[model samples]
Target chain A: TKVKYPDGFRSWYHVKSMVIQPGHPLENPFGGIHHVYANAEAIQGLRGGNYPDGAVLVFDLFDYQEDNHALVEGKRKLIGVMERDAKRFSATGGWGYEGFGEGKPDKRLVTDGGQGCFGCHAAQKESQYVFSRLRD
Target chain B: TKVKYPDGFRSWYHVKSMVIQPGHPLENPFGGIHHVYANAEAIQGLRGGNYPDGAVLVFDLFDYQEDNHALVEGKRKLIGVMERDAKRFSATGGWGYEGFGEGKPDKRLVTDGGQGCFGCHAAQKESQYVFSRLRD
Candidate 1:
């Protein structure tokens, strides 16, 4: 199933921003600035643990640079997404995962049928395979 | 006149994230990843363009690094803030400006009596000396 790219996700409800410093346990590939956003439907899931159908979550990642005494966001790194569908993605616990290159909708990076992504997310079974929490 | 540090701004309504790249006009000390947040009172000001007496706005800044294909947030550079009080801060358009080093509540960085900060914010008189807008 091709997950449609989230358009205008920057205007959605921003859940939180996290930075993985150098020495953190998840600092290898996951080290970066992560901004999480949720659509109206997904907001319900974040408040509760059960994500309904049509719930979509976004992970906006970027490359950053330090100049003088400031940290600035650089070129786009990737846009990771998780879409919910109970029957369509039943194998992965009713969720479809995809990563877009540099936020370009046409650029697709998931070639492994979301198996690799699900492996990490599977650890979050309690939260319906979601790792993010609403700031409020 | 000392402005108190803003506590728990991360849970506030996030207005936006802007990155001033290498060759942008406002690059000098203003360049970096800027995350604007508005408290409950400030949210009303962002929408109506008329800030009340208790509105508070915060700017979260951080240093970043590029690794592999991701930009990660490094140490915090500062936490810039604007608090409103018509009578108390009547000199700076009903706002008190302060910068906290590394998000530390005790570390204050504003010494010019907010003259420099107000000078730039003066350009935004139409927005009540506020430069940020609400996302939703």
Candidate 2:
């Protein structure tokens, strides 16, 4: 189930032009598909190491957007997200953990929290569980 | 507590190479030193999470003879020995933990077993806990 974003809050746009570094095992991945239905409260419940009540799963997509978007387009690879709740921002989004494994077709919901996934997200505690990017 | 190398069992020399990309925080730091010693029993005792009896501490001077030799010379560093005993191999030996950090020198013994210090040294488990190489 998806939550409805406030007017003008939900946007669906394909992120293209991303690039993947050579020698990287994963090919190009997509990025950036905002959904207004999911928010932070739902993610907090999921963070408890167990599922919570009334949790609706949603996800935003982030594709590779560097070096000409070669990986996503050429390699037929993409990143998926699974979110809960649609009212606030949460970091419960799962990456493409299931699909990229050996002999797997890539549709499973694999967890990445163990591989320093949530640990890194928790480092940005000040950003309302969102990430801030810095560039010159 | 030390185990003598069997007669004719010559220690092997090893070299490690490390390539730190430019602009990294530790790309260039202060002085570096290298040393060697024999404390297999002490190391084992330390690893057992308790001091063991008859632990011997011994050390020797080492020279840097590689591309990065100039970058790591004349600095006083500690070196300890590792033995065939798994307990000693897991204990803290060689230099103390303070050698890696600069500010407010910690000069404390690396008594913790899971502090990553042993994890790095564990790579040479087969070599009797010896890690030789200046440019790694």
Candidate 3:
């Protein structure tokens, strides 16, 4: 099924970013490029307290590559998403997980879309199932 | 949706594996745990340069550690499945995607199961829509 990608997600509040290094004992499978985008509503909640209902977090990923002179993003790998809805998702700690292939709906991964998104987040039940901290 | 963690998926051929860093990029959102499992049929395809029908791939995941010691496995995270059926899924390049919370269907995350999976895996059509390479 087709899910919302959060309109103009790039315009959303930038919620820190991270990179997965190869051979670092970590699964940097998607080429090591990542960014987080939280909608204005979610950003508001982040500033005040736990993520409020309707808050959405979009994780943008890409293939990290280096040019002749500098490192750069080569191809987008996936766009994983998280939505906060206390009443709607009372089961999984009030959070829902979804993913897509980069920016479109035509191509998708053969991998399961979301089981991985929440299982680990389960550890952060105290924080309303969130762990994105803005940083350099 | 649920993809029962096939009987003894762990017993299947271990084709590849990766680690998800906690609060790191790439898979931090997914609780930072990942492993790839496949049955003999799937392994056969890898060894013979062709994946026939009915081959299944499983991705087992979990939370990570290292705050006190080196990053290690924490808790049971997720179990993702990818079943290949060229005729069954001719539209999405012959792969059926499904995942569960800790290997159970009741804990399935809210998402468009196969769509996201097929969407991303489409990128590697040349490799039969798979990314992991048999270890050397």
Q: Number of the top candidate by DockQ?
A: 1
Please report the TM-score between candidate 3 and the true structure.
Answer: 0.46
Question: How many backbone clashes can be found in candidate 1?
Answer: 3
Q: How large is the C-alpha RMSD of every model relative to the true structure?
A: 6.5, 21.4, 19.9
lDDT of 1 by residue, B1-136 (tens): 6676788786567776765546667666555566898888898888885678778899887665655444445667788999999899888888999998888988898898898899999999988998876632
Off by over 4 Å in 1: A1-34, A38-57, A60-90, A93-136, B22-28
Clash pairs for candidate 1: A32-B72, A63-B71, A64-B71
Every model's TM-score: 0.63, 0.22, 0.46
Ranking by lDDT: 1, 3, 2
lDDT per residue (tens digit) for residues A30-87 in model 2: 2221111222333443344333433332323223222221111122232233333323
Q: Docking quality tier of candidate 1?
A: incorrect
lDDT of 1 at B108: 90
Tell me the lDDT of candidate 2: 0.30
Sort all candidates by DockQ, best to worst. Answer: 1, 3, 2
| Angstrom error at residue A47, model 1 | 14
lDDT of 3 by residue, B73-97 (tens): 5566677777777777665677777
Candidate with more favorable, higher TM-score: 1 or 2: 1
- Shift in Å, residue B67, candidate 2: 29
Provide the overall lDDT of each model, using Cα atoms, as 2-decimal numbers. 0.78, 0.30, 0.63
**Cα lDDT for residue A99, candidate 1:** 88
Q: C-alpha displacement of B125 in model 3, angstroms?
A: 1.0
